[PDB]
Amino acid sequence: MKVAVLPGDGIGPEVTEAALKVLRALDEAEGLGLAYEVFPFGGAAIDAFGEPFPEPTRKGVEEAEAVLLGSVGGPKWDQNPRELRPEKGLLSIRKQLDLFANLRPVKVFESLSDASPLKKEYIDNVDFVIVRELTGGIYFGEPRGMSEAEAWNTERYSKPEVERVARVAFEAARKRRKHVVSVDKANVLEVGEFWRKTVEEVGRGYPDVALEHQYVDAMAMHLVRSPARFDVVVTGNIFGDILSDLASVLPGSLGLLPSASLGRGTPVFEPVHGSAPDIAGKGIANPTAAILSAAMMLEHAFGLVELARKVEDAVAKALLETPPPDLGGSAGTEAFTATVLRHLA
Template identity: 55%
Template sequence: MDSAPRTYTLALLPGDGIGPEVTAEAARVLDAAADAHGFAIQTSEHAVGGAGLDAENDPLPRATLDACLDADAVFLGAVGGPDWDGYAADLRPERGLLRLRARLGAFANLRPVAVSDAMAERSPLRPERVAGTDLLIVRELTGGIYFGHPRERTAAEAYDTMRYSVAEVERIARVAFEWAQKRSGRVTSVDKANVLASSALWRDVVSRIGADEYPEIALEHLYVDHAAMEVVRDPRRFDVVLTGNLFGDVLSDLAATLPGTLGLLPSASLGGRVGLFEPVHGSAPDLAGQGVANPLAAILSGAMLLDALGEGAAAASVRQSVDALLTDGPLPADLDGTASTSDVGAAVADGIASFTLTS
């Protein structure tokens, strides 16, 4: 008698704008990968962001949070849009995402940036400078100046506090070093240790963790201004880039320009039992409902989700199918093609079987 297939529960949060459209294609591809690799994914959809406000006047309804906490993984499409600009700050759609990350214990944001030969011509930089780029930014997500206290604004002045504890730096450093073990074995830690006390602590802790626990990993330190220059000058020099919340926010968006489109950039927020996976792009309300949104960032976020579940072979087949599509088509509008959102998703899903046979 055959045993039941491995089964994972996935909370789908389509969200706002183009979120539902790209989420549908990511789910289609995940189902195809599961079928090809002998496991099952049980999905349930829940409101978040503006959709949560419309349904329950809450950007993170209780039922949505409960489903996420009970799931094996969470996939989010996008949140936000002008329809909800009138809400108070604590009820804005983006606040639901911040609350969800906090409840999931997500302290590490992972953003891979890869530029294939097929995509290099679309980069704002010279193709020979960016072709072959394959870096991973590991950004600390819950500390630093965005969350430090005291913070205050008066009529005469305003101030924020950049604060990091040893424990916060240790745990994010270990994430970066462990990813480097799976990749090319190099970590670049980015800080401003020459002028910031929190960065001096950061550098000391990262150096100690590297020397004591990951001596086989090559570690270098760069000041953030130098790192920004190097991302543009020679992005191929990087493997894993480890940095804090503020610097990671800036460097992630800078690196996002390398492929020439946000439509190819996935992300994951990890730390607790349940990971959160989402495309880097926003809700693009001007494109919503037209069937022209590029779903590849969402699909590649699904590949990261599969990796996190331990289904590495399935994740690899998704990426191979995406790579084939980028070379042979059909391409979406933001890549100068004419394929619809569903056409692109169907092509990736259909391609998975052939790459499963050869992987």
Template identity: 55%
Template sequence: MTHQLLLLPGDGIGPEIIHEAERVIQTLTRTHGLSVELERGLIGGAAYEAEGDPLPERTLALAKAADAVLFGAVGGPQWDTIARDKRPERGLLRIRAGLDLFANLRPATLAPELAEASSLRPELVAGLDIMIVRELTGGIYFGQPREQAADRAYNTMVYSRAEVERIARRAFEIARLRGRRLCSVDKANVLEVSEFWRETVTAVSADYPDVELSHMYVDNAAMQLVRAPKQFDVIVTGNLFGDVLSDIAAMLTGSIGMLPSASLNEQSRGLYEPVHGSAPDIAGQDKANPLATILSLAMLLRYSLGETTMAEAVEAAVGQVLADGLRTADLHQPGTTPVGTAAMGDAVIRALEKTAH
């Protein structure tokens, strides 16, 4: 089967890191039997400069036709003063909405070789492997009514049963692929919407008797993430709580340059991107860490294309280069070998070639 993939390099370091991921895709087609057709599109500041729109209609049409989208980054100081609806970040928000990407997957994993880079003690984080599943299109960020006036402002946190059920089912399915443990995070002791969330997730759990479900209040979950993070396998939570908890989990790994993410719709088509931004200060200097983008590609292979074996091969190749002591600038420590963006891509490809059939 031939898969349709769309590459959206974007701005800043986006073109560099997407280039390295594309080289990995080419290696997989040559050595592991991956069959893909690649398209490219403009998004963000690059799209604004070319077409006056951070998300041209052609790009959105290509995204809707693709099995998955691999995205780099958007933004830069040169666009900070243009009209808000034309700024690069609006392109990303619009493509998420246009594809109905309701499930945001944010893994926080830490190879033993990088344990010293974490702000926590190595024994607390070595071997960390958490998946946070965040509901992305509902909750307080989108709830109506909302208002800002001279002397007050308010937002409303709203979830429908259908919204909670679909994110819960996605989380249970992901838990089945991992350690079969799911922790649902809410604030049910204070918020009615969280009571409703907890009741709905519990009802869905009847369809997944093989997955152990637990519940935790969000304040406790934040504490537990920095006290004993390896107790978690999969966490599912709403938009606001997921926004906060995923950033806490990200810092446990020591470098945001290592973190991939996925945003999926009902059909498991998705947009995959590194968590870090466009880093315009190092763009074009061969300094960016491409590993988060390459790991995002691994997520794409697993969750949208169903190519689990290839996903595991890519992840193993990344693990091998880290074990070999290669580090980009964001990870460099005494005793390791500093490399640039392209050299890190070369190393991943060499490791991947060794696993060819």
């Protein structure tokens, strides 16, 4: 199991190590053959090598089997130009590794129901994964423009760009509850028609996985009214981006959520959360999304579906037994990684 580890800036060093401690425990315990190396990335690499993603790191993530990525960003770098600010690097590891699907799961962890905005009975059992197409659609499609008089933007998709994210989604579904929902506007737009017939084609090949289709406006109401009725959801870019942000409020007690870019190259796995400089070095950072990005690496980069579910259960039990400071508890990063490890045995 070859992992390029990119701890990044701010709390990325602390929280990526809490994740590596889980992955070493399991490795010791199961014999997984973890081999990992730590590479420079982010504001720390702008400081050291003069650019955010320097060619040792380019090579590193190009030769590994998985990237564990922490977080970059810090104010210190906003001042200077564009390709020398921590976030440029995030599009270059995305371009280089040809990543085209972003997977964002939402789980509302039983113990933390009361922090959710929805009454308990709506969040019970929420476990779904929205795989968003990443590189296409209106954000990048063309023609585009702006006059004194008018502005325009095209939303475009080719059969290839739709089949790529649909196969991620069906394969993605084989590992968890086997149901895909695709999301479109096919009753009004033709891009939506086209998406719908292509995902139904690509669906033929994955017969053990059920497929349903839904409109974006109707899926927006179903993520508050019945979110538990979904396992994997697959959608285009702007709709995946609106819909994953709406889905991120369901857990409530934020900062617990993981992310994984997937594609032709090396899968990248990060927590959804920033550098959080304010608390870097203090021990208090909540490692739950980092530890859960590790579990997504195990499930998508190494096929180890059974073990990823054991790490998500240990972090469930752990959030129940020692909530971190940020959930009305007092467990630092280390005492929390501890109780996670203590249930992996």
